[PDB]
Write a protein that binds this ligand. Structure first.
Ligand SMILES: NC[C@H]1OCCc2sccc21
Length: 288
């Protein structure tokens, strides 16, 4: 696409912001608010539409986990409700395969889901698929070569370095090599033939380390760390570079946005969000 969209998030309470950053000229645009504030959601794009999935509304008047799927049309600058998921999913992970949205894990109250469901936009309907081998919230999800990966998270008792892969034509999950680091709330994305896991929380500290999984070799290698420790960051890829947005570093809710160039193996600060926040949903699509 052309713009990096950031939806929702958390600072003092769950947020309704939708803002779009243009890497070509550095500018931010504030767009139509989410109908309901939410943090811990995931974002994704299918057919030029932006989707906001799951999350939780942490508010003065209570706290409600979200089963909502909401669609944003850049041409109209309007959000529309879509079919809700079977269950609320806070700290959700999402990935897209063949035009379908997979919702992975997350929490509802003290329930930590291992369940997974798939949304088909052409039918506006959700269907459950095979559950993961492990309950995971704060799970990172990415897609490579039509396979879905769930990385890290928290199972209700332990934070995880484990990861697993979903094979759609077998409707089956299999464990892959665990990361070298325990990470909850890491940013997970795909670049070239590798799954990247950036930042997160290991139980004691927020992380700046970054490692990547080569699917051919089945090994995790550390790359250069980010300039700022952060968990509950947003992540996306734009023209071959990784962008990480916001997060929580144990002291401050970050407005920092960093950009990773895999050819130089370096991170640089590229912009700041209009305000610090964590738990945003991020995706890339056309200009509104
Ligand atoms: N570790 C990040 C964490 O910070 C406190 C509030 C929220 S909402 C989503 C994630 C988070």
């Amino acid at each position: 696409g052309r713009l990096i969209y950031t939806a929702g998030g958390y600072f003092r309470q769950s947020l309704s912001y939708l803002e779009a950053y243009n890497p070509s000229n550095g500018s931010w645009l504030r767009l139509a608010d989410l109908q309901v504030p939410r943090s811990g959601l995931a974002g994704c794009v299918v057919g030029g539409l932006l989707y906001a999935v799951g999350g939780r509304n942490n508010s003065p008047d209570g706290n409600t986990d979200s089963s909502a799927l909401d669609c944003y049309n850049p041409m109209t600058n309007q959000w529309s409700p879509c079919a809700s998921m079977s269950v609320p999913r806070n700290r959700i992970g999402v990935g897209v395969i063949d035009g379908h949205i997979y919702a992975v894990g997350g929490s509802h109250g003290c329930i930590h889901h291992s369940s997974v469901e798939r949304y088909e936009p052409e039918r506006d309907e959700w269907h459950l698929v095979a559950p993961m081998l492990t309950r995971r919230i704060g799970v990172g999800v990415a897609v490579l070569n039509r396979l879905l990966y769930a990385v890290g998270g928290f199972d209700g008792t332990n934070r995880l370095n484990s990861a697993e892969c979903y094979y759609p034509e077998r409707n089956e999950w299999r464990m892959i090599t665990p990361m070298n680091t325990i990470r909850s709330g890491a940013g997970v994305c795909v670049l070239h033939n590798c799954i990247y896991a950036a930042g997160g929380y290991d139980g004691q500290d927020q992380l700046n380390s970054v490692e990547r999984y080569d699917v051919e070799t089945e090994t995790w290698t550390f790359v250069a760390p980010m300039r700022h420790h952060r968990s509950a960051l947003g992540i996306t890829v734009h023209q071959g570079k990784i962008y990480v947005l916001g997060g929580y570093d144990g002291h401050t809710f970050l407005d920092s946005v960093e950009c990773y160039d895999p050819d130089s193996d370096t991170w640089s600060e590229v912009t700041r969000m209009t305000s610090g926040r964590s738990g945003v949903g991020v995706a890339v699509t056309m200009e509104p």
